[model samples]
Every structure is written in structure tokens, then in C-alpha cells.
Target: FKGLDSKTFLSEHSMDMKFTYCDDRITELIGYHPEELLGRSAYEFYHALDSENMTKSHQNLCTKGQVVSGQYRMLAKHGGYVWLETQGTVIYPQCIMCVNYVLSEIEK
Candidate 1:
């Protein structure tokens, strides 16, 4: 997962926030220095209206020990907004390993 290219997830509507990870690929997408987004919660970069849902989904992922999938809006650094279909899963026995994906739209 760490070696995956984040550009595969880029949206035409403009990215509310670049893909963030503990890996160096995150830095390649955002064009910022490595570790720039380290320690920042997703809410810090999400759209205000979407913050609540994002937080809830994150909490559900952490607490439920299962994957949660939903649609959300996010604010791009350049100020545009985009819709995202996010799915998160916990991959570790201790519930510490986690992975998520942001699809561009919600499939009907």
C-alpha cells in the first residue's frame, strides 16, 4: 500500500485534501515536504460540512473493527470542493492497522 501512487485517486473536481499517509508517496502528491501532514486529523483538511461525517466514519472504523463506506464532501487546498466515497478497514489484530480508500463518487 505504501508503494501505491496516490495520483490514481486524483479527482477532476479538484482535491479537497491530498492523500495523506505515513509513507513518502503522500508528499509526492501534495508537493509539500515529507511528513507535512503527519499528526493532522482528516478533519483539519476536510470541508466544514463534511467534518462531522468524516469524524463519525473514522470513529466507526476505529470502534467497530470493521470497514465503513460512505460519501462525503471535502475542501481542496485551492478552495474547490469534491465528493468522495470513502471506505475504511482495520487490518491489524490489535485494531491499530488501518487502511482506507476515497473513491470519487458514490455508486448508485
Candidate 2:
């Protein structure tokens, strides 16, 4: 595990939520203290225009048990937005592994 400060580490691990992994880059790009996001739903921080699609994609992955990948916009803590390509896989009945990368173009 990365040695972020204690508060940051605690914040990230304090939530009871779905998903098993969060991209560390999200912390740097979004300006959210790592702890501020841990355990929180992605929808809480997603760009408004992209929230619906993000939710649908996540639902599809959970329901179909397939690895899902897509691109969408997400809100940053610094008050702007960025495009991201996110990939998620179901690792168990209640766990998902997710990773995200910045995207240069938007695609539906």
C-alpha cells in the first residue's frame, strides 16, 4: 500500500461501498484527499452529464458479469472535468476491480 498520510489512508478505507480499487491518479487529478473518496460512490463525484452512463455501465457489468470498459467525463475536485476511460471486472459476487485512465477523446 502507498504510504499516504494517516488521514488520507483512513479516509480512503473508511467507506462501505462497492468496487475494490480506485485509481490513485484520481487523487492527484481531482484534488480530493484520498481519504475523501475512499468508499464513496463514483456517482457522487462524476460529472453530471456522464453520471447516467457511468451508472448504466456499472450496472451492466454487475448484472452481466463481464468486464466492462467505456469512456466518460468525471468531475474533478479542483472544479473542472476530465474524460476518462474506465475498465471494471467483477472479481467476486460482491467485489469489483476498477481502473481508470485519462482519455483524449470522447466516445459514446
Candidate 3:
């Protein structure tokens, strides 16, 4: 129930995004294409208040080569928050990780 969409739906929605990389699957998640995101910094898309933690997380990831599940809010193209549990790893230029994020019953 609630916002829990189908597995097929979100999997098709999951994407591999970075400061300079992204995929078309992004549209189904945050409503943007890779081209739109490629020209922007990831920081510009995240919630400003979450920026600090994201920076810290990035530093930790660089130091440890991995970061565990951390929840943060990203902006949807529609001007709303997209709750995401993001984990990162060291890939030098491009990090790849599997995600199984689901749409939960979120209240605003």
C-alpha cells in the first residue's frame, strides 16, 4: 500500500549517479534524464541541509573505500524531497553499487 510501488518499477527506476555521471533510469526516480544531471553537480540536487553530511560521507567513502547505508533527501524535479538511502564506494572515477530502494509510506 501507500507509495510502495512495484519492484519492477523501482528497479527500472534505480540509477548509477555521480557528480558527473548518471543514467536514464533517473527519470523514473527523480524525474530527470542523464543529460540534465550530467551538467550539474550532485550537491546542487541534494537538500542543502543534507550537504554537510553528504560531504562527510563522501570523505569517509574516499578514506574507507565504502560507506554504509545512509539516509538523505534529494530534490525531485517537481520541487519536493525524495527520501533515499544511499551507499557509496570507491571506483576512482565511477562507482557502481546495487540498490533496491523502495517507495515507503512517506508523510510530509
Candidate 4:
């Protein structure tokens, strides 16, 4: 709605994890179902560098027990990676909700 090319760049992605490890609800978002993702590290989806950055955001959520935002990549099952972003909220193990919102995508 602003003068942004969000229609071209924005995407929908979401997931819930266990302390940033287990892929409890990782199936639909990244194309990896339960078995494929169960023990697999996030390197499967997130680019190595992006994966590391996500850990920083995860730790941010860990410390503050609320929100953190960052970019990530999704490894398509059929082929290559696509840019993705997330805004995460953690109520600890009981729940982690990641929405498809990128802070930089919106103006301050």
C-alpha cells in the first residue's frame, strides 16, 4: 500500500519449533514433512548464514520471551532456495508462532 514492491517480494511462511530445533510444524511452510525434518538441522531450509542469523533471533525471543524478526531462506523440495522472512513470538516450549512479517519490508 505504501510505495513498495511488496507484491513482488512478499511471501507467506510460518513455522513452530522447539527451542529452534525440532520441526514440529515445519512441514507445510518449508516443504519438509515430519520424518524428513524431525532430526534434520535448519541448514536444510535456511541458507547457512541465514540459519545462523535466525538463531540470533531465536535467542532474542528466548531472552525477551516475545518477538524477534529476521530473514530466512526456504529450500524448495523441487529445486532451489527462495528468500523468506519471519517475525517470531515465543511463549517458550508451550508455543512458538512465526508470522510472515519482515520488519524492513514495512516503513518505520
Candidate 5:
């Protein structure tokens, strides 16, 4: 397995899930500089096939106040998807802290 990096972000606690903040390390994983992602809905970068499950996780996060999303795919800058998992905790009423870990690039 090819080891990859991780990132952290803050997102609004709503269906839109817009990023309010992103760690600088995000650029190394997804090629989007932190500033490039600000105010953009996370769904904009989700892999179509994974969106349903990712949505489910988001619901769980909101309902339960915290969640560990299982493996999912995120769009990468180079036109492919990267495998990732995120653990997020609600900051209450406004945002959630999401720590995203990349599990692979093209590896299975």
C-alpha cells in the first residue's frame, strides 16, 4: 500500500457543508490550496459514485454530533479520485472539525 498524507478542515454544520477553513496540508493531498477551497461546498469535490455514502456520513455527523466516515473517494487535482476517510466532531451549532486521512492514491 502506498502511504499518503492527511488534512484537516472546518465545515459548516449544514447540508451545503461549505469549507470555512482548511489546513495547509490539504494542498499536498488534493492539490487545492487552503484558500482555493474556502467557502466551497465539499460536495463540489466529491466523487459521484461516493456521494451517497458521504452524504450518509454527513447526516450521521449532524445527528450524532461526531462520526468516523468510512473509506470514500475525493476528487484530486489531476483528474482522478483519491481514497480517504474522515473523522469529524461537531463544534456545535455552526461547524465541524474534519480530519481527513488519505489511504491510497491508485492503490487498492
Candidate 6:
């Protein structure tokens, strides 16, 4: 964590693609406590312009069983965008494991 340029966090999604679990570092990246995101669709926090891109990435994961998305923007609770890159894999029938990296923060 000390020498890394990017901050990374892990999350688990339900079969329906809702946030079921997220690690504590998510707060440092997006300013939202994990509890605030649980049971919510990850798309709800995606920047509007990135919706289609994110959706496509999700589709790839669902169909291919794994996916790594290009850099995209997720809405920050403090009111800007957090640039992120995500890699996800379906570890089991109804569970997905995702590793998300915060590349940078951008002011809108």
C-alpha cells in the first residue's frame, strides 16, 4: 500500500450483480463506507457516461466467466469521479469476485 500508485480493493457481487461485500479500502477510494454500498447495484455508482462501457464489461464477465475493463469512472460520494479499472471473475455459480483499482480522482 505504501509504494503502490493505485489503490485496490476487493468486492463480491451476487448473481444479480449487487454489491454483497466490499473491503474497507473502498472508503479511501470512493468516500463511501462499505455498508452504504451493500445490497446496491454497482452500476448505481458508475458515472452516467460510463454506463454502457460498464455494462459491456459486466456482460463479458457473465458470458466469458472473467473480464477486465478499461479505465472508467465511478461516482464519488464527495461529488466527483474516481477513475477505476476493474477485473472480475465468476468464482462459483452465484458469486463473483472483483478486484477494483483506483487509478486517479477527477473533478467533474
Q: Between candidates 1 and 4, which one is better according to lDDT? A: 4
Each model's lDDT? 0.46, 0.56, 0.55, 0.49, 0.75, 0.86
What count of clashes does model 6 give?
0
Taking all chains together, each candidate's TM-score versus the true structure is: 0.53, 0.68, 0.68, 0.53, 0.83, 0.91
Worst 10 residues of 6 by lDDT: 1-10
Superposing all C-alpha atoms, what RMSD in Å does each candidate have to the true structure? 8.3, 7.3, 5.0, 8.1, 3.1, 1.9
Per-residue lDDT of model 6, residues 1-108, tens digit only: 333533889999996779999999888778889898899999888888989988988888999999998988988888989888988999867899989988886567
Candidate 5: stretches off by over 4 Å: 1-15, 106-108
Candidate 5 lDDT by residue in tens digits, 1-108: 434444443333343588887777767767778777778888888888888988898889889988998988888877788888888888756688887887766322
lDDT of 6 at 2: 33
Candidate 1: where is the Cα deviation over 4 Å?
A: 1-34, 93-108
- Tens digits of lDDT, candidate 4, 1-108: 433223122222223343233333333333445555444444456666577777777678767876645556656555555565666566435656555432232111
Q: Which 10-residue window of candidate 5 scores lowest in summed lDDT?
A: 6-15
Over 4 Å off, model 4: 1-43, 101-108
Tell me the tens digit of each residue's lDDT in model 3 across 1-108. 434433112111112334455545557767666666654556676678788987787667667867754777777777776777655655554453424343432223
By lDDT, the better pick of 2 and 4 is 2
The number of clashing residue pairs in model 5 is 0
| Candidate 3 Cα lDDT to native | 0.55
Report how far off residue 88 is in candidate 4 (Å).
0.9
Model 6 residue runs over 4 Å out of place are: none
Which is better, 4 or 5, measured by TM-score? 5
Give residue 57's lDDT in candidate 1 (0 to 100): 68
Please tell me which predicted candidate would have the highest lDDT against the true structure: 6
